[PDB]
Amino acid sequence: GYINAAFRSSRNNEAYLFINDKYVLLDYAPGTSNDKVLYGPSFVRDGYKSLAKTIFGTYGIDCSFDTEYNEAFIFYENFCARIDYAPHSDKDKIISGPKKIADMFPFFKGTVFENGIDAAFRSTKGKEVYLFKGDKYARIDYLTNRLVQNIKSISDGFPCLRGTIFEAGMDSAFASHKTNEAYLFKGEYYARINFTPGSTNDIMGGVKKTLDYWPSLRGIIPLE
Amino acid sequence: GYINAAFRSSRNNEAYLFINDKYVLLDYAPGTSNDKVLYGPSFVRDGYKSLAKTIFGTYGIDCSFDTEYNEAFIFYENFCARIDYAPHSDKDKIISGPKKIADMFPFFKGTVFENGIDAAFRSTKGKEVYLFKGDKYARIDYLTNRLVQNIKSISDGFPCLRGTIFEAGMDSAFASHKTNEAYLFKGEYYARINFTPGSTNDIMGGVKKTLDYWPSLRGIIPLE
Ligand SMILES: [Mg+2]
Numbered sequence: 001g002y003i004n005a006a007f008r009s010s011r012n013n014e015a016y017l018f019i020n021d022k023y024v025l026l027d028y029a030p031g032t033s034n035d036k037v038l039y040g041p042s043f044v045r046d047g048y049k050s051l052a053k054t055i056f057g058t059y060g061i062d063c064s065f066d067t068e069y070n071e072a073f074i075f076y077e078n079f080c081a082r083i084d085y086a087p088h089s090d091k092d093k094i095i096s097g098p099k100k101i102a103d104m105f106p107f108f109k110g111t112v113f114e115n116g117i118d119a120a121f122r123s124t125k126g127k128e129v130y131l132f133k134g135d136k137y138a139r140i141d142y143l144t145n146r147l148v149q150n151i152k153s154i155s156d157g158f159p160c161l162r163g164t165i166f167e168a169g170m171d172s173a174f175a176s177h178k179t180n181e182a183y184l185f186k187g188e189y190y191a192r193i194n195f196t197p198g199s200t201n202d203i204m205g206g207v208k209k210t211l212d213y214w215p216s217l218r219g220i221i222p223l224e
Numbered sequence: 225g226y227i228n229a230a231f232r233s234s235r236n237n238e239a240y241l242f243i244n245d246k247y248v249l250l251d252y253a254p255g256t257s258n259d260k261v262l263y264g265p266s267f268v269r270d271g272y273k274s275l276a277k278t279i280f281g282t283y284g285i286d287c288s289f290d291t292e293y294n295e296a297f298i299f300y301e302n303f304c305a306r307i308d309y310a311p312h313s314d315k316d317k318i319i320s321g322p323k324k325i326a327d328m329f330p331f332f333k334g335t336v337f338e339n340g341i342d343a344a345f346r347s348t349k350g351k352e353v354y355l356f357k358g359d360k361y362a363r364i365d366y367l368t369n370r371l372v373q374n375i376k377s378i379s380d381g382f383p384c385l386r387g388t389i390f391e392a393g394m395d396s397a398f399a400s401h402k403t404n405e406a407y408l409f410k411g412e413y414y415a416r417i418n419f420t421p422g423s424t425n426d427i428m429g430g431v432k433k434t435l436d437y438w439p440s441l442r443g444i445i446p447l448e
């Protein structure tokens with residue numbers, strides 16, 4: 001039981017990480033000692049009143065991504081929604097959904113992302129997002145609803161992951177407040193990256209273990 | 225666009241019918257000609273505020289059944305919920321779920337019923353319910369969450385439907401308010417059967433075009 005989905009918040013250096021039917025709000029300390037839990041562990045249903053009576057309350061959220069404002073997209077299997085998470089507040093709302101993935105992003109009909117998605121993180125370029133399923137990643141425009149470029153392998157636009165455990169997927173990803181950094185998680189390891197939008201590019205590069213850099217996660221991952 | 229799901233109402237001679245992502249309430253009037261629509265045809269999200277923000281409000285309901293009181297199980301693909309439908313009021317609520325079928329009815333795990341049920345009707349015997357997927361049926365007790373018998377073909381438990389279009393599947397069903405009777409629906413054809421719990425009882429044989437005998441469904445099915 002590891003982090004299944006994550007997305008980057010609207011506060012500075014704050015992120016949201018979904019494990020099981022649960023989540024935690026994190027101050028993830030990109031460049032200082034003290035990374036710390038602001039809220040949770042808490043069930044999705046109990047912290048997200050607006051999701052208490054949906055499939056996301058019952059089971060949680062298995063992929064996810066920040067959009068803009070205090071809005072993010074959230075996924076469970078075939079199913080997704082757009083939400084207002086209302087950080088450090090209580091006024092969370094469903095804006096679109098719950099819809100299937102094919103009806104929310106029609107360009108995934110016939111793809112491998114149709115019936116479910118592992119991980120996502122928000123890009124720096126315009127309205128771009130990187131999505132990931134099995135050995136494949138996808139680049140999209142959540143605003144125009146458009147597949148910016150063809151479905152390709154992770155190793156193709158993130159070649160620095162070849163031979164690593166991310167060569168064949170990602171359990172969980174989220175985007176950093178540090179420009180062009182993203183956190184990728186799988187099993188019990190985490191990864192930091194500097195990616196450049198629209199270029200075959202590297203680093204990194206220092207694949208680390210999660211709790212050895214993430215002490216505010218001890219006791220909480222694994223979740224068994 | 226025909227009938228997809230029905231359950232019998234607690235108000236005598238009334239039934240709810242789910243078509244597409246829509247519903248109707250109806251005095252289906254078995255002892256009379258004076259059939260009538262009571263409510264709708266409305267959207268599920270609108271009629272049922274409890275369901276407004278759910279996969280059911282988005283996509284409608286594909287199978288349901290009366291249990292007891294003002295309560296009914298409702299389904300769409302692998303998910304389902306118990307709700308109180310609050311006859312003729314605002315005050316309709318989610319009791320249980322939304323869960324997957326395999327978490328609501330564990331004994332369905334590994335069977336055809338796990339990814340979806342076609343239709344279902346309340347038995348007169350105890351807390352028992354009959355359910356159909358494809359060309360098989362189940363006999364359950366929803367109160368002790370168990371399968372009363374092995375899943376066999378409709379042909380085997382219901383010998384009256386042999387050589388009828390109902391032999392390989394039912395799209396929708398509900399029990400009458402009269403003893404040992406249920407209605408069944410596939411396309412534009414329907415039938416009224418007289419069922420004895422735990423028997424090989426043949427009859428009846430009245431497979432009729434639905435619009436012919438349901439005056440108050442002209443304009444509604446086939447819902448385009
Ligand atoms: Mg995942």
Ligand SMILES: [Mg+2]
Pocket residue numbers: 227228229286287341342343394395396
């Ligand atoms: Mg059906």
